[PDB]
Symmetry: D3
Subunit: 249 residues, 6 copies
């Protein structure tokens, strides 16, 4: 294995454990939670920092928006030695109890996107690794953060989530959205389906937690809908979960 | 709510916790693990016994083979007050490490069947309830049984699994089978996809464990292929998991 | 899996246990009732949801084996019966009327089935029609006429989710179920049941003859319009039609 | 109802019973089997002759190749009063027993085409009317022609049937072809799926019989593969079937 | 390569450039635009005329209605040496600016039909050849005809376009129709999707222009809806485009 | 009214009606050098935006990142801010054997083997490039003297599905479809045009695309000379020249 084309990393540049935010600008924020983390690469939408946690090498690499760029990151990180991943992002609540400021931990994801379909037949479930999921749930409890563990909807079109009525395929998006609501779906985001399915194929462990920035369903009902933007809580949960996974390994 | 057409049960007949084997003949065997279990109903392929565990009312109801009959059981049990379900069945191993005699615990299921598609869009994941899954995993470790926690393939055609080459759609079955193998799938069975998706819709908790009867992949490679038919171990794991869920209620 | 040559894993039958002609109800409890129509029938196997009785009709060996609810269990029955020598099958069940002329008490004979289920898709590409054998269908139609029972020969809708038929509005995929239901109504569909699609398609692949008749238990569409909707539960009439059809097929095969 | 745009026919121009060949040039041939048939219209690929059989008004209208043109014919004939249709065409054998010269009677059809999908969800079976099918089977028996009653494969791409290996989607066509063989499919043609499904929606009776022109599967195995082109036999069976259907309606 | 089964043509009978109308009766009208056109064949719904344009051999062959019959025509013409095709038909407008009498030039087509799916995976775009499309656009401008260059919707069920509400799959047809409207679709017809995709596989150039016969969407909104039937303009544009292509190919 | 865009962090007035869109945010500065007095407008997430002028007209360059999901977001937000003419400038892997490293590919349409476009339009709708933009690109390539190939390009969501399909659980599907693309005259493989073309059809804007061929796996499989390329200057020059004539034609 040599220099990776998209991420510009080589074997030895990253740890076995990696946190993956969508926004490259969030990597520095996350790296602050690691020990002696330095920037290893900044290529395209991929910023990578590597430091340590409990003395073990760990990294944080952005994926950009969408399963296409996210799967490229997992593939190249895996080739360089990574085997445990935790996506840390933002999401829009669906379930009425999921409010801005809360944390969502994905147990699985709705594969309404194309990247996963180029990895596995659609019938295969996008499911998060059990160990990573439990580590996240336990971390949130220990830190005292309100959390929701459940399925999250993934999609390829961000504007299909907030303006489905305008789309040529509005009927499809609207019908499926009601379906997600009737299935107990917690929130909506964009990268977990691709990461979970790719992880199943690559044989690595992957989980995800998110900061709920708001809830459109609560808004439509006129219910109080506080907005949030600071991902610190979600980051703290992911880092504590990593410490747990590292020690258990 | 009154008398259920298919199961012939009514509110009060069953507990909130129900174990669900596929074979009606297995209900009596499972009922022996409960305290003072009595036969409640014997309608069609649905045999139901209700007793107590740790003083809480519990039941066991057969689903028959297939998502169609299994979904009916969950629907009617739910209408009568059931809200926590654990399927206990048999399966065929895929992953080479999954041998006859071992126990498999489904974290999710491949929706290669039609029942779940009449409940949810195919993109939705058939995922087991986190609490039930952890209860099963812990029970298996406590009892010292070799277990495998992962995704199981569900299907509608049993003979499509064992005689794919002869089917008109052999090409599709064989292609998908290789796909399941490359996705770390643990074993193959038939009811979890329907039960998991139906559960997501109904708002109830559902999990599954199975006795591995054999492994066709090991057989195809000329490897050891011990056969097993006694589901006592899978049943013990399910009963202990139920006890845990009852305690943590 | 069965540990013995010829022993069928699920049905627990062996070559010699069943005749070439088999009636297939969904409910295992209905087998005894059907067996009474044969001469000297005896139970040969009772495994899982599969109860099998064998006797004779006009001196020819015949059987009745339950399939349980759904294409998954029904396909297993046909596969294992076929391996034991069966080659002519007639499903006898219950169905819910769709066409407004299909009333409770009437008999429906399936000429084909709507493949809105997954079992048939694991046998054949969805484009292939789930169509009943011509000889069996004609035998059923002629038997109902001879016996004087009002019948309707046409397409039946098959499905995997019973509760999707009666509670579609509640389903996450309600939009799909409701839209397709309107399509079935506009295509002259007679009634709704669950096993014929799987049985007809498997039969086409296995090279055996299969047909189906059903007792109409009611009609939801007539009920929705406020039209008289008499309910029914006794499958005796449907059974009589099936047994008479078997007599016809047995004699014609000679 | 007035003048139909594509067929250029109006109520009264056609009978309740119509035979439908694919080739417009085959209409004159079929018309000879009726009594005092006259040319009614010649529009696009649609030629229509109307005459009588047993004193009842009957017609023959070509459909052209494919479900798109055939469905237009059924829709417009239906609007003008037609309610019983029998397609008479040619087909290529699949089943090894189906040889050139033989007649095939479609009990149903494989919907591997797009026209039917714009009428009904793909799960709906393309199934021929019981009465018409029995009439055809009884006619073939009475006339003494070797016939095969079973499912036929329909398709939209003729060259996908004969040159599948060359197609970009060769893998799909070849795989499905093997599936049709393993399902007992009798032969391959192109219009029945569209006509059967449309008939189910329109509430009319439709059936089909064909002249087997050859069998590629027999040719692939080096078996004797007689070639045929005279649709006379298939036509005689369809006309005899129309005759008994007419008598039964009386 | 010998006699083609369906079109009844053989190498040498047609030029490299072919105009393809849907109606066999329109071939004679189009042939008048060529120099010294001769009737080469009249088989089934396929009428073929061959003459010259600027001294170069060119032909006109009807396709009948639908992708199935049109694909057969392209396949057989191609085997006989044709490599540049221009479909000339009629269409119903969708885009509110597309009025009866106007000319529509297809830059691509919506594959809501089955023929193309037997040639290519549905994801592949039905796109017209750039050179042919530019020749058509420039020709329309030169001749002074109002034209619209864009995507056209293809379908297999003509009656699904005008009577969607009645169809068993009305919900699907209606939803998709609204989608086509929100994607700037110019008009609706039936053969371009099949021809464009088949052309991509066969390695030939294909384009299409149509006479707008009316606009149902304008009518639905109560807007002036002038209707037309004379394809003379659409034919002139295609013939002028052929002259351009012929000269540029030199 | 339209305000600050969440993802791109731009507002009405920040960008011109004409925008060039590379996939790599790092390629924006290089493209901007082709404009007059370009200045950085925003740098948010994978979206870097520069705005300057070309022949007096305001023009911009904004990166899309990899994939239709990020690309569609860029088009949506740029459109809201007033952009109506887009030209993607990227890199691609050749398929047709005549498409080799260094050449320029101009997409006339795209294979929708990705999910973003499906959340915009039914799959039957063609992903087709705007006629004016495509012609402008073709004319520019000829004028500048660069070898170019105008045709259909394959779009996908999984980069590693293109380069190691044999490994994938769905290898059978990827491999079969790849042969189909080869038999349909497909020129090259990339990732964002399908989403951009379809979104443009819906939004009512003009979109085209040109790419630098960086390699050709099919040529390599046959042992043919397979030179690698990475300098996008040529593809950029063609896009800028196309923008220039499009601007002139609109005036
Ligand atoms: O904030 P990140 O980590 O990018 O995640 C969320 O943000 C983007 C949508 O704004 C998508 O990536 C979504 O999943
Ligand atoms: O033994 P059970 O519980 O029936 O489970 C397995 O057994 C049957 C297949 O033999 C299917 O039900 C499968 O899921
Ligand atoms: O009464 P049977 O024979 O079971 O048939 C009908 O009854 C069941 C539904 O209640 C399904 O099997 C349906 O097809
Ligand atoms: O000869 P006809 O009646 O046209 O039928 C067959 O002939 C054509 C194919 O050559 C298709 O129409 C096919 O169904
Ligand atoms: O007039 P033509 O060329 O046949 O084209 C149109 O006419 C027919 C529909 O009336 C279809 O072929 C449609 O595409
Ligand atoms: O180099 P860009 O412009 O990103 O384009 C190509 O590069 C990436 C793949 O390496 C994808 O974006 C593909 O479309
Ligand atoms: O609503 C939201 C919020 C964050 N990310 C999303 O994808 N959707
Ligand atoms: O192989 C097997 C064994 C048990 N149950 C199944 O469904 N498959
Ligand atoms: O309504 C009914 C009645 C019997 N069986 C069914 O499947 N549905
Ligand atoms: O092989 C054949 C012969 C006639 N018609 C067809 O469609 N196929
Ligand atoms: O509306 C129309 C007019 C002509 N051709 C069509 O296909 N549709
Ligand atoms: O092979 C390649 C090269 C560049 N971009 C792609 O998407 N694929």
């Amino acid at each position: 294995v040599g220099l990776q084309y998209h991420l510009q990393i080589r074997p030895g540049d990253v740890g076995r454990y990696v946190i993956m935010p969508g926004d490259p600008k969030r990597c520095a924020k996350i790296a602050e939670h690691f020990d002696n983390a330095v920037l290893v690469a900044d290529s395209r939408e991929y910023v990578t920092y590597t430091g340590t946690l409990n003395g073990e090498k760990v990294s944080v690499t952005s994926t950009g928006i969408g399963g296409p760029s996210a799967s490229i990151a997992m593939e190249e990180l895996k080739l360089c030695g990574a085997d445990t991943f935790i996506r840390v992002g933002t999401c829009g609540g669906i379930e009425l109890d999921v409010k801005g400021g809360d944390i969502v931990i994905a147990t699985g994801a709705i594969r309404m996107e194309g990247t996963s379909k180029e990895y596995a037949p659609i019938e295969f479930p996008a499911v998060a690794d059990l160990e990573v999921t439990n580590a996240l749930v336990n971390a949130a409890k220990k830190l005292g953060y309100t959390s929701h563990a459940g399925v999250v909807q993934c999609k390829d079109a961000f504007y299909g989530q907030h303006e489905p009525e305008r789309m040529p395929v509005s009927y499809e998006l609207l019908n499926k959205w009601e379906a997600w609501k009737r299935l107990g779906t917690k929130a909506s985001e964009m990268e977990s389906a691709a990461l979970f399915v790719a992880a199943s194929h690559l044989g690595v462990r992957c989980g995800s937690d998110f900061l709920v920035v708001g809830n459109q369903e609560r808004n439509a009902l006129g219910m109080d809908n506080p907005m949030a933007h600071d991902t610190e809580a979600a980051i703290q949960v992911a880092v504590e979960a990593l410490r747990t996974l590292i020690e258990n390994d």
